[PDB]
């Protein structure tokens, strides 16, 4: 199916406590393969997947240079943004950056992303046409003008439509065994009394890859939001994912309900009924 490569960077200011924390991670789809942490020993970009280990020192030296620069840039940024908003050097602030590309099933380019957040909210984002900017406010407008004058969009387009995609293809090949795998969910249901007239039915999806999945509850074969609970998809710690969906029901009515499961490891959607 379709695939993606994304890099995430977090920079956090530590007033009265020295340099800002800087963490970077790179993902192919839902698999992380690289990391950089300002708080760790190496001060280098480190591999977090088997299929990236084969890259030579040229790769590691260069990516280490690159990410350190990202770090420097964000360090200046934090100072700049505090001024933009006339904030004090008492509070800690956060800068977040995310960029990457999507490729369709043909591994051809599909979409490009470059987004920037200050203190947990949109600041400036590159639009889908990769030629224009969305600025959250007038402070971000200043930044927009800077990046239009310096023609940053055009620089990003080259990367997102070229380098980003070409290297994603390379990881997909070298990591074929894992990245091109599809683990279908193992499913089961649980039942718990809530009072003596209500009971909870919980629909479980385990050991699946990738993480994209849909769990819906139907009642008499009709979709049911209402008394339903959907937890955030979670990592098992072994490359697979987990998720459950629950519904509270009147005792004696359990058989009215069915959980439906959609996942690309499943040729046909699963329908589950209690027992």
């Amino acid at each position: 199916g379709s695939h993606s490569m994304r890099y995430f960077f977090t920079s956090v200011s530590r007033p009265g406590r020295g340099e800002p924390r800087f963490i970077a991670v790179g993902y192919v789809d839902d698999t992380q393969f690289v990391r950089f942490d300002s708080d760790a020993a190496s001060q280098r970009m480190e591999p977090r997947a088997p299929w990236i280990e084969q890259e030579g020192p040229e790769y590691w030296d260069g990516e280490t240079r690159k990410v350190k620069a990202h770090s420097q840039t964000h360090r200046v940024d934090l100072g700049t943004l505090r001024g933009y908003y006339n904030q004090s050097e008492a509070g800690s602030h956060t800068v977040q950056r995310m960029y990457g590309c999507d490729v369709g099933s043909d591994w051809r380019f599909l979409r490009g992303y470059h987004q920037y957040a200050y203190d947990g909210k949109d600041y400036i984002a590159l639009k889908e046409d990769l030629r224009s900017w969305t600025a959250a406010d007038m402070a971000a407008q200043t930044t927009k003008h800077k990046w239009e004058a310096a023609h940053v969009a055009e620089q990003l387009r080259a990367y997102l439509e070229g380098t980003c995609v070409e290297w994603l293809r390379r990881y997909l090949e070298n990591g074929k065994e894992t990245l091109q795998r599809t683990d279908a969910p193992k499913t089961h249901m649980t039942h718990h009394a809530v009072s003596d007239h209500e009971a909870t039915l919980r629909c479980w999806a385990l050991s699946f890859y990738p993480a994209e999945i849909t769990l819906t509850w139907q009642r008499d074969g009709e979709d049911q939001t209402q008394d339903t609970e959907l937890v955030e998809t979670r990592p098992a710690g072994d490359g697979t994912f987990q998720k459950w969906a629950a519904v509270v029901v009147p005792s004696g009515q359990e058989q009215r309900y069915t959980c439906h499961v959609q996942h690309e490891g499943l040729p046909k959607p699963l329908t589950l009924r209690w027992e």
Binding site: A69, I124, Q155, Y159
Partner: peptide, 9 residues
């Protein structure tokens, strides 16, 4: 492979 476009805000 990461990007080397680093424009400051």
């Amino acid at each position: 492979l990461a990007c080397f476009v680093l424009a400051a805000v």
